[PDB]
Amino acid sequence: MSSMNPEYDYLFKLLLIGDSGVGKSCLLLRFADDTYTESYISTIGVDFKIRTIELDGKTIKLQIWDTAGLERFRTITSSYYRGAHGIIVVYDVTDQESFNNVKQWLQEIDRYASENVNKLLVGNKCDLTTKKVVDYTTAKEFADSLGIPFLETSAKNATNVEQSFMTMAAEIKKRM
Amino acid sequence: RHLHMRQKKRNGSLPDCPPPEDPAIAQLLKKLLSQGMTEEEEDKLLALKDFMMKSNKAKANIVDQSHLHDSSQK
Numbered sequence: 001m002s003s004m005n006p007e008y009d010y011l012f013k014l015l016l017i018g019d020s021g022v023g024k025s026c027l028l029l030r031f032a033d034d035t036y037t038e039s040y041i042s043t044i045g046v047d048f049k050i051r052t053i054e055l056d057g058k059t060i061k062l063q064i065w066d067t068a069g070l071e072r073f074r075t076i077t078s079s080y081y082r083g084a085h086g087i088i089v090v091y092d093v094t095d096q097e098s099f100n101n102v103k104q105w106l107q108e109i110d111r112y113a114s115e116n117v118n119k120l121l122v123g124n125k126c127d128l129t130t131k132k133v134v135d136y137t138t139a140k141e142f143a144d145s146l147g148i149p150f151l152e153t154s155a156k157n158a159t160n161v162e163q164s165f166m167t168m169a170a171e172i173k174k175r176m
Numbered sequence: 177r178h179l180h181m182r183q184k185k186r187n188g189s190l191p192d193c194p195p196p197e198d199p200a201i202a203q204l205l206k207k208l209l210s211q212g213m214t215e216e217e218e219d220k221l222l223a224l225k226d227f228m229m230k231s232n233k234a235k236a237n238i239v240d241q242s243h244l245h246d247s248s249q250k
């Protein structure tokens with residue numbers, strides 16, 4: 001047994017990672033604050049927002065962390081992954097390089113995250129269809145090849161944004 | 177080969193052109209054309225035919241050697 005806060009049953013620490021400009025801050029802001037903006041401020045270090053949700057009648061508190069995607073604020077060893085309950089790997093569906101680097105983000109999870117942490121591949125900017133480069137089938141083939149759930153999304157138009165985070169919260173509850 | 181046949185149809189040297197026979201070629205044709213491949217880029221790609229073919233064949237031949245250095249790529 002352990003102490004339990006009356007407001008929330010489960011504290012699920014989520015973490016967003018991915019190349020710069022993939023839309024991690026936009027996704028975090030759209031989910032935790034229903035706001036979006038064209039002004040780009042490159043994240044440094046860490047940021048987090050808390051959002052309380054409900055799934056299967058359980059009050060779930062999500063602490064979603066947004067890590068800096070730029071080369072200069074990244075390091076080989078990382079201690080942000082430590083204690084994450086689930087990790088979202090974001091990529092920009094309009095930039096194949098961000099999708100290719102997903103392979104490299106995954107190996108960071110297998111090295112520093114919890115041994116069986118939940119993972120979720122997210123393809124932000126799905127609203128730029130005239131500029132999209134990856135196929136949904138190309139991503140699904142890759143996500144399923146590793147068993148990680150996947151949802152294409154758009155922070156701009158809220159498209160699947162809520163569902164992406166809600167899905168990982170459910171998956172973590174399923175894990176524990 | 178498919179693009180070259182489309183060139184013949186484009187320049188009036190053939191009456192009409194069917195869709196590609198193997199779906200992997202149609203999937204690629206769809207990819208290329210949906211990505212904004214203009215007709216002039218098809219003509220230019222066809223001029224680079226020999227280069228792309230030889231180069232692709234040589235790139236593959238290096239991948240056939242990538243097993244010898246698989247440990248250093250990490």
Ligand SMILES: Nc1nc2c(ncn2[C@@H]2O[C@H](COP(=O)(O)OP(=O)(O)OP(=O)(O)O)[C@@H](O)[C@H]2O)c(=O)[nH]1
Binds near residue numbers: 022040042069126127
């Ligand atoms: N069209 C479109 N543009 C988006 C979307 N999400 C983000 N953007 C654009 O991408 C820019 C950067 O978004 P960020 O969330 O700050 O990117 P990031 O992943 O946080 O990058 P870092 O903070 O450097 O790690 C935004 O200012 C928007 O211009 C989206 O869903 N659709």
